[PDB]
Amino acid sequence: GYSDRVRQITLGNSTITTQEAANAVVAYGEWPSYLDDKEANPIDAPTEPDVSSNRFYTLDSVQWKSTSRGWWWKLPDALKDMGMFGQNMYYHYLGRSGYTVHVQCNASKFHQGALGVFAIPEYVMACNT
Amino acid sequence: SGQAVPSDVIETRHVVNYKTRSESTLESFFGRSACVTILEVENFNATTDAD
Numbered sequence: 001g002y003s004d005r006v007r008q009i010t011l012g013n014s015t016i017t018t019q020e021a022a023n024a025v026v027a028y029g030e031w032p033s034y035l036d037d038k039e040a041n042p043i044d045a046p047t048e049p050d051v052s053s054n055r056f057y058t059l060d061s062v063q064w065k066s067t068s069r070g071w072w073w074k075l076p077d078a079l080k081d082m083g084m085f086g087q088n089m090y091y092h093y094l095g096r097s098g099y100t101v102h103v104q105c106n107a108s109k110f111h112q113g114a115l116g117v118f119a120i121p122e123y124v125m126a127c128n129t
Numbered sequence: 130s131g132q133a134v135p136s137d138v139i140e141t142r143h144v145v146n147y148k149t150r151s152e153s154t155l156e157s158f159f160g161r162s163a164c165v166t167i168l169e170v171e172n173f174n175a176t177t178d179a180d
């Protein structure tokens with residue numbers, strides 16, 4: 001019954017379903033976690049907003065055309081205006097976060113195309129001068 | 130002097146401090162060869178008291 005193609009993800013008040021997945025990646029084989037006392041740095045009691053902020057935010061959709069060359073976002077920049085996550089981010093000097101990234105693109109059995117979806121640590125890009 | 134620490138006046142998390150004051154011991158603070166003077170000497174055929 002259970003399938004690599006069919007998945008549910010629930011975080012806070014938000015759920016995603018997919019019926020045509022291909023497993024899921026856990027970057028570098030490591031699930032996100034809270035910061036341990038033995039690795040901590042700032043000494044103030046942290047804010048852990050939990051379900052207010054740790055939930056699926058859907059960005060504006062983009063259009064894939066035959067002429068599209070691709071798309072980029074940065075994190076946490078892409079979520080800076082997203083509900084209570086954005087408020088917690090901007091009210092504090094310091095923040096850390098893991099992410100579930102869910103990229104959605106359906107077509108038909110008669111369409112063709114392939115998107116590479118990459119999560120890049122420190123994605124530094126070239127300037128235009 | 131004032132004695133209060135952050136846990137006295139704010140809510141604090143537990144932070145394990147592994148850092149040491151190794152480099153501010155007197156031995157560490159003074160553990161450098163410092164230039165204290167520049168002397169001058171010469172070698173030539175001296176014909177005057179000054180030379």
Ligand SMILES: [Ca+2]
Nearest residue numbers: 136137139140
């Ligand atoms: Ca206290």
Ligand SMILES: [Cl-]
Nearest residue numbers: 059060061062
């Ligand atoms: Cl949209």
